[model samples]
Target: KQLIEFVRWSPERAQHYRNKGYWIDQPLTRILTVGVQSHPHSLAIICGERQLSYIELDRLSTNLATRLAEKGLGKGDTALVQLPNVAEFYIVFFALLKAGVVVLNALYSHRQYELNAFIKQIQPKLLIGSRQHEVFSNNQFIDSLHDVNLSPEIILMLNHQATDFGLLDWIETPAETFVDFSSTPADEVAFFQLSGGGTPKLIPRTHNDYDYSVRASAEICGLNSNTRLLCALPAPHNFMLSSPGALGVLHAGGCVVMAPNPEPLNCFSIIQRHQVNMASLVPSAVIMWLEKAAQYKDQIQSLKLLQVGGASFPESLARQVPEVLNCKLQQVFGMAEGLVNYTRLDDSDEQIFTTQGRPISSDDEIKIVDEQYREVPEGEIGMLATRGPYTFCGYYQSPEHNSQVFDEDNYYYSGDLVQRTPDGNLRVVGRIK
Candidate 1:
């Protein structure tokens, strides 16, 4: 979006993919239109005291999209949004897509060092953050942004009283004044979903690949209009955002209930109130949820599935999820660069507890290679290298890191030492380095 020359697919590879349908030619905006076209009156987002129906969600996002467009913040323009779990997150997300703007969903925990690095890399046209976060508490981060000489063309801070610009005002722009985008090119970068590591390294995800992953993961997880997903984890985490995350829920015409963080008691109340059907968690947070859940086990009976992500979700602990949380457990091990694996709903107890499940797409080509980059013996632990319809060829302006991780065939080393089971399932053992 910054006009930076990131690595792209060769024409030969592009043509080959077009012949296949994995590279569907549709924009990220298509997902937003899902509810607008099918369930306009249904609830879409719930954050604290606020709620938005599908039609309201579409209209509010359109208001901001139109205003941003009026201010010259569309295609080839970048946006940096750092906000807590709030309805504004999805509003800004869809607004950016609707206006054809590329974005990076920065974790709200990120401070100056992370901010400076991301801002320098993207040089975004818009900055959407919150006054509640300490970084933005007193306009200190905004000053730091100016110090980097990369202040956004527009800054919309939640809870700030407006002078000439305001997020609240834009969200309320007249519906009649807005004109929706009919379409955006599928091949261009959509939004940048970040890695979990502390240092800032932006992954430039294209609309086509990202949309396909969400649609496929939603199908794999069996999401539909009835899905009421509780987002207790950080709204921007790759696991919560699109490993059949809120975006995937939205893609399936479902409802998203937001929580500020993965605090157990708070999430429990929200879960019960919303009748949340599913929730995602990291291992530590799952433990926290389980401990608090014991106090209100039956009240949270609405939860039907619990997706535990991140590494080292011990089998001992995995077994406890169903018993304690009153829901099925779905293990997830994935990265922001794509390639999400899930423990299938129909799998045996052992397989569901031990393995990280299988690839969502049959075309996801994975190879367990030795240090020399050769394929390993059967059942031998080795580095996992893969290339798929959803994985990125390179991160935005990150050729040096890309060279270290990607091979001659452009297969990405996922940095996991994993062994393939006799049934073609993966059991992650350790990190490669």
Candidate 2:
């Protein structure tokens, strides 16, 4: 019985968060099951030409979970999953969660070098990939995994028409016997999120912290059963997953419309067809969408909210979102380690266009500090440091690196240089080089 190693918050802090109702003792799997209980027949996901209702999603995920558990895969096991925007991602996500397995959802764009870094860090027990990705198109990478003595015990692939390790077989196959399984502790590590760098820095997000972020974000974004959200960004990204992205949509009984990419032609067509009311993007993608939005102006009329997130959002570009898309513009600034900020729907144009919103919870403590680690003036640009109910305590087994980024008080010093506005909004200036 191996223990999943992660930095846990102090006992006092943990109990305080739970007492204050910030860290609800719920697993991330509850994000889907809660909706399934309330709206089992409601539309849940749209990927390619396939659509699944809440019941269908829950059933498929439970089938996969049972199969995994029956195969002797359970608590403390790790999985590395790489897939594009697709319904299968969520199916596999919930399956791993329900079966008490930790997962690292790698981006489809990751290649051998990046994947190697992740494999070295976690030494996952299972790997799920798509043949559509270049690294998985041949056996070269799989052979290398074995060469490194880190071969996943089980490998599953999508779009592998001839392979014995086909993902469809695993999902569609029924378990011969019922195998009971449960999730890890609600406050234990749920999955890994990657931090930007030369190589991926594995961020360990706990179920308690991650689920609260999603639930709070869903409420802040005003999601409901009628919400049709277009998921055009990388599905594994923090901005797309818990920024009230696909997971939020699922939590609120809303429908998630998948897009292969954020290209105007692809997402615009999807948004029109599905009557997608909400979407998320980064500054660069938002520029491209605005550039071509004029042509599909009428088709995308159903869009109600456009969330644009990034550290370097230009005010001029931010102002164009409402004008060009004819939708409410929301500015989001956050990191994979946690501490997400969003501009309120009722904020003035000055806040919406110029600032990067504010923290979701009053418990999110922000302190800008100079190189000396002394707190800077409120309105002065400094390195952004934060600690809160949702913000993570440390990276996975990265103590040397963690010491550099986190303070003695446990505040995570995000490298971004930011200043707080008079109204508590943050304006990201640049990275702390």
Candidate 3:
């Protein structure tokens, strides 16, 4: 049998060559470098009543990282980070990444049962969260976990309404100076984003992985230094933290317009107030915005690109967005395990709504494979598998589960069923068993 590889990774390869020198390994380095360079005085994050300029963000992040480091936090230490779409999320996330700590993203909606399970399994060294994580209290959860002997050593609190025992205010006082650490490698573990199924698995990524993804997204989407990005999604979540959403703004030296939730009214207002050029939304949020487009269309018209992802976008909804909202709509397909596909800037309306388009660059290999691990024919539906520099190696501690999904060939099974067209385009059909 003759084997054929259909995808190309030339763009990413070219970028690697271009950035061979002066490349920092982790996402924090990219953020700090950008903060120090072009956007030192520019705004980096904005919540309802809080804002952090690049300089302040850098300083505060350094202070937080220093505080955590002083507590013996370092590489490979798992830190459970649970917060809403607030400014503190960005500060803690980057600070932990800078300190070479592995981040375990704890969602806001997670209940005590889920929290208990995660704490028991991950046994994170630190728990960084707000007082309002639905169920886990400052001391109650700590006490429970302590009873089980799974309690983290440190509990860094953020934006808590009231303080209880075992809660330490991480950002109470600003440090006089910033502490710098030696470089963390590009391939070191970055974060642990949970999987969708009842069993949450850890998905790890590196600094180079995120840096390339962000820069590639900016180049692909034509985002520049002046491009203003509206990001209403949760910052600490994998979907928003992925390159184009967070890193893209940084790569372009632009600004991120943020909010706590994806309320259409609030989103439209922010777009108008900030004159946001680019933004991202999940399918549900997109539907909500479209529902109220008539009331907010004039304000939302300022956006040039409105990228939608997280779930399959209905073709009918995709076709109607441009006409209803007066902005170009693009479908983005990404995985926490490291694969991204987006409709091209110049793609036709049919392609934008119907297909997931191609990979960011040629360096990544995407294939539709049958259950037998054989490649499916063009246009045939099968499980989507990918391999590339950005794709994660495996789950954090589940070797058996990793073996089940990852074959001997190193391809990470995306669990998404898709069809590879003859022209190299991809159309997601559904999920595979």
Candidate 4:
């Protein structure tokens, strides 16, 4: 069993963690420099039979970035990115980041109604997407956007074999230039991720915020260059995208092995073939794995870390973990709002099954406060509020919500319920408001 590091809680220590500097000056420049320095020849991305090395990834991303720039994409431009897990998504994402354009990530599960609202709200200059998703096509949503007079200037379509869109031919034409622009500052808005609910909220994250959080997550979970992460969740989701598991792998010169969809049977095959060392699972997936573990255990033995979240892991599933998968099970509780809490890597099975561990670093101030907004006693449950350097500054274009959720001190009112144990660990109860 790994011995997890436990630290005494202190406000000063937390501030120190939040103040850590970026490893590289810029996110895109960092990725390119790291890719070249550490693993230029290694496979950076793999989708079925297609493989992209670090060198190729850099070239392709630069080419696409230059192409988008020529089409009037520049700093402050919003680009809608709606694609499933594919090589093209990574290329376009890095490319847009390089061009200092803000990305609006659209979920694949979004229907025409949701899609229409998103396009109108963000008013993106370019809309990039795959030809087909499970129930809709790029053209289907494109038509919906046109109804609102919000048609994008550039539509770089993917998976063209599924649809006969006239825009297919544009992808084959070579882009004119591949020049690298000077860096965008770390504090600038890099992208937007939506918080799901009836009243959806748009959250904008800075390059520094994401870069720091990813590095913290990697260090906490002991991820390194030898790590191979299996991303079972959707790539656009903040948990998979901003979490240490995916970005940490990138920081460590590791590879992310992803599937277009999270089918349990397919996941089993990929885990064995790639010898994946780390994987993230939601509660539903943990249940699915429990049902199939007997048949797939031998094949999945290569997995060393199982980071489970989304919904709380059932106690029954937690009990079955050691016997079924024989790996350290880390319970993680994270919100798109930008706080990620995880059980320590050295935590015993009991703690892993019962608690949501401590904050990743001291910079995160976890407070259990009462209805009157006063601090609660140890072991008492109340609404959880967090303040940290990396916590989101405010909601994008929602001044009303920003006032309600963020306090004068910049602490985020995390609408979660939790209790602090006498031992200094936090135990989540249920939401208060």
Candidate 5:
């Protein structure tokens, strides 16, 4: 077993967040079980023509969990998983969590540049990949994996020919008997989530803190049984998973529709056909949708909300949602080290258009500080320093880097230069030096 080092919040800090009703002391595995128990027969996911009920989703993940556990993989083990936007993504996710394996879900676009970096840092014992990906298109990459002592002990390929050990095969076969689970504790690290612009080390998020983000963000977005969210971006992106993403939808007993990619037809077809009301996208994808809006606007009348992420989008572009797309626009400026904000649906027009919104929890401590880490006056742009229920204290096994970014008080200094609006919303200005 490869034991990866991850930092957990201090006892005092953990208790403080728990006292505020932010950290529920529940793991994500339990969170999924809540939905499975409450809505076992309800629809959970839609990918192409394949529909998965809550029971089916849970059962499949359980089967995979058992299979993975039997392979000598369990708690304290790390896995490097890479897959595209498919329902199986969630299956793999829940299965890993259920087996108490920490996973780093690499974006589908990652090649040797990022892949080598991730493998080096995480030193994952299990590697999950799709045969369709260029990284595994032929045996050449397989030979390369062997070259880097980074090759996982257990390799599970998706959509492969005659593999002795395949993820699909395990899920398809029924387990015969009871399987043991070495589930991680509530306060322990659940998985490693990536930050978009950083030193490239994976950010380790604990079960309690990550679960809080899922539950709270779901509340922010008003997800429920009737919510049908179109997941068009990479499923591994934190925005798609727990900025009230698919996991939040699942926890709320809502349905998640998968699109292969965020290309207009890829997402538009599913949004229209499934009557998807909620969807999330990066700014580049938003512009693509806008360019194709008139062509498919009336075709997608069922859409109710459009969440645009990434820090590059102009505020002026935020105003074009209602008039052009006929839906609510939410700008999500966040990174996966774990802070998320959303403009509430009830907020004023100016507030919705100008600011990205506010933090997921009031317990989310925010400080806009100058170079000296001194708090700047209200409405002045400064580096965004934060400590809260979900924000991580440090990167996985990187105490040296942590010393430079985290302060004496334990607040993580996010590099975003932002000014808080007079009304308490965050207007992201730019990034720091």
Candidate 6:
């Protein structure tokens, strides 16, 4: 049972979570498979004019997974994947996971500088990228990958037409024979999520932890089979990927409508065309939609819920969402490392507008500490630290840095200055440390 090594929770802590039913011991692949079982013909993804049913999505990914496994890529292998907001992103994601490969999903904005840093850290055996990106437009970057101490055995391109390395070719062409492979263990690292920094740090997310968050988020956000979500943000982002975003929608047997970006010009038309009932955005993008929505409000009449996360959400801007867009507003606060907070759908305007809401799990332990690391008084602002069933114990391989951020009890100090309300919600103020 080889696994991608990362700092694991103590045996006692891990057992405790399992016993409490917080850590559901299951693979993240169940997100798609569960939907397939219940609604195989249901719409899973829509990109532009293209659409895929749950069964179709599963079959396409399985086809690619078989190909990768036949190529001898399996458990303990690593892959670096970079793609835009397209249907192929999910295809590549599920394929790599099914092939038992640990994936580092790079944002399309990431160039050679960020990619090279990731390559040096993980030394991925496979690279899946797009020709639309400057680095992959030609063979220069791929040819020079060995200089970063990485030599990828396989390189697949999205927009390229070559049969040897083209992503669509592999996907469209069924394998001659099915190769046997499965996902990493439920408690082991399924993928690496990069944390925000000049040099992006790797955050190891396990199958059990990530799936739990997706399951809980879908329930909290009230996702259903009829729910059609507009994914206008970056597909790989923690906010858009699983804060009851794309995966959450799919897990709850719904449809995910893709957009290149959060531009109102593109998204407004798509929402109306697809009858998208839900959407997620950051504070800045929400402002852009609000500005253009005055005249184009008719194009987004199908939207019912708008979830805002990522940065500090001002009450003034948040209040404008429901008033101007005529949709329910839910504020989300979370990180790729885990621990997501969401304002309940039935909450009052004050809770949704002023605070970032409470944690997704009751097992999520929140601590607001002063400069000395001592717990601050309730309602007093301090640095936010948290540990829980879904929260990670440490970074991928940075022991020294992990010691600095994670305290003796393994609580991760997220550098967010926050205060707890009398009703137990979190108000993010600023970052002091």
TM-score against native, each model: 0.95, 0.98, 0.89, 0.90, 0.96, 0.98
**Global CA lDDT of candidate 5, please?**
0.85
Stretches > 4 Å off in candidate 6? 161-164
Regions more than 4 Å wrong, model 3? 1-27, 161-169, 175-183
lDDT of 1 by residue, 1-433 (tens): 3443456777776666667776778887788776788889888998888889989989998888888887777777888899888898889888988888888888888887888788888889899887777887776778776776788889987887555356788788644444444334677777787865848567878778888889889998999999999988888888888899998999999999998888888888898898999999899998887787888886688999999888788899999999999899999989888899998998888888888989988878899999899999999999999988888888787778899999999999978899988776788899967
Backbone atom clashes (below 3 Å) for every candidate: 0, 0, 3, 4, 0, 0
Q: What is the Å distance of residue 381 in model 5 from its true position?
A: 1.1
Identify the candidate with maximal lDDT: 6
Q: Residue 120 error for model 5, in Å?
A: 2.0
Which stretches of model 4 miss by more than 4 angstroms? 1-19, 22-25, 134-140, 161-174, 177-183
- State the C-alpha lDDT per candidate: 0.84, 0.89, 0.72, 0.72, 0.85, 0.90
Per-residue alpha-carbon lDDT of model 5 for 396-429, expressed as tens digits?
8788989988888888887899999998799888
Across 1-433, the per-residue lDDT of candidate 2 in tens digits comes to 6658888888888998899898999998887788888989899999989999999898999889998898888888999999998999999999999998999999999899999889898988889999888998888999997787999988889998585477888889879988889998898888899985588789998899998899899999999999999999999999998898898988899999999889998888899898999999988899899899998898889999999996588988988888999999999998899999999998999999999999999889888889888899769989988999988888999899889888888999888899999986989898875
Local lDDT at 279 for model 1: 92
Of 3 and 4, the candidate ranking higher by lDDT: 3
Q: Tell me how far the alpha carbon of residue 343 in candidate 5 is from the true structure, in angstroms, after superposition.
A: 1.0
lDDT of 3 at 202: 67
Whole-model lDDT, model 4: 0.72
On TM-score, the stronger of 5 and 6 is 6
Alpha carbon deviation, residue 265, candidate 5 (Å): 2.5
lDDT (tens digit, per residue) of candidate 3 on 1-433: 1111112224554367337531244454675676667768877776666667877777877777887777777765667878877777777777877787777777777778777777777678888776666565546666787788898888766645554322234554544545555334564556666775475666665566667676777788887767778768877555577648776776677777787778999888988888888888888988898899997778888888888888888898888778887888888888877778888989877788888777876767777888887998778999988877666667766778878887776788978999976656788889976
Error of 1 at 205 (Å): 0.6
Please write out the lDDT profile of model 4 over residues 149-259, one tens digit for every residue: 898787766766634432334333446765445335565677777784553567777676677778778888888777888877888887787567566777777788878
